[PDB]
Design a protein around this ligand. Structure first.
Ligand code: FUC
Ligand code: CA
Ligand code: CL
Length: 158
C-alpha cells in the first residue's frame, strides 16, 4: 500500500475508544480503552499506554472514528513486557454501523500471531468503508492493545 502522490494518516487518534470489559484490580488504572489511540506505541503495559480487557472470554475493543472513512489498513502494536501470544486469532472488523458491538462487521484481517512488542500493519483485502473498527478476540485470552492505528490515504501535502 501507499501509492505515489498520496500520504497516509492515522485517523484513530480522532476517535473515541471503548471495550467489552476493562481489567479490574491492581493494574486496572493502566488498562483504559483510550490507551490504544493516544498516539503512543510504548508496549510496556506498565507505562500506561496499553488497553487491557477483563480476562473474560471473547473480549473486544472498539474505536468510533466519529465519521465514515475509506480505510486501507490497520496497524497494531502488541504488548511488549510479556504475554505477546494472547492476541493470536484476533479479528479486525470495519463497518459503517455497529453490528453487535462491531464483532459482526466485515473483516479487514485476522491476526495470526505477533511477536511480543511487535508493531505490524494488516492490510484489508480492498479498502473498506467504515466508521467503526473493532478488534475482537474469540478466545479465552486477555486482549491488550498498545496502539491501534487506522490508516486512510489522502492526496499528499505539496
Ligand atoms: C497486567 C498483568 O500482566 C502480567 O502480570 C500478566 O501475567 C497478567 O495476566 C496481566 O495481564
Ligand atoms: Ca498507546
Ligand atoms: Cl477523546
Amino acid at each position: 500500500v501507499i501509492p505515489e502522490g498520496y500520504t497516509q494518516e492515522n485517523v484513530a487518534v480522532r476517535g473515541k475508544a471503548t471495550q467489552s470489559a476493562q481489567l479490574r484490580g491492581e493494574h486496572a488504572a493502566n488498562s483504559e480503552a483510550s490507551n490504544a489511540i493516544d498516539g503512543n506505541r510504548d508496549s510496556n503495559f506498565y507505562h500506561g499506554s496499553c488497553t487491557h480487557s477483563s480476562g473474560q472470554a471473547n473480549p473486544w475493543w472498539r474505536v468510533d472514528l466519529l465519521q465514515v472513512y475509506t480505510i486501507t489498513s490497520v496497524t497494531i502494536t502488541n504488548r511488549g513486557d510479556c504475554c505477546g501470544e494472547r492476541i493470536s486469532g484476533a479479528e479486525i472488523n470495519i463497518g459503517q454501523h455497529l453490528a453487535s458491538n462491531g464483532v459482526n462487521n466485515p473483516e479487514c484481517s485476522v491476526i495470526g500471531s505477533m511477536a511480543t512488542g511487535e508493531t505490524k500493519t494488516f492490510h484489508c483485502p480492498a479498502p473498506m468503508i467504515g466508521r467503526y473498527v473493532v478488534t475482537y478476540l474469540p478466545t479465552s485470552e486477555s486482549l491488550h492493545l498498545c496502539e491501534v492505528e487506522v490508516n486512510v490515504d489522502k492526496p499528499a501535502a505539496a
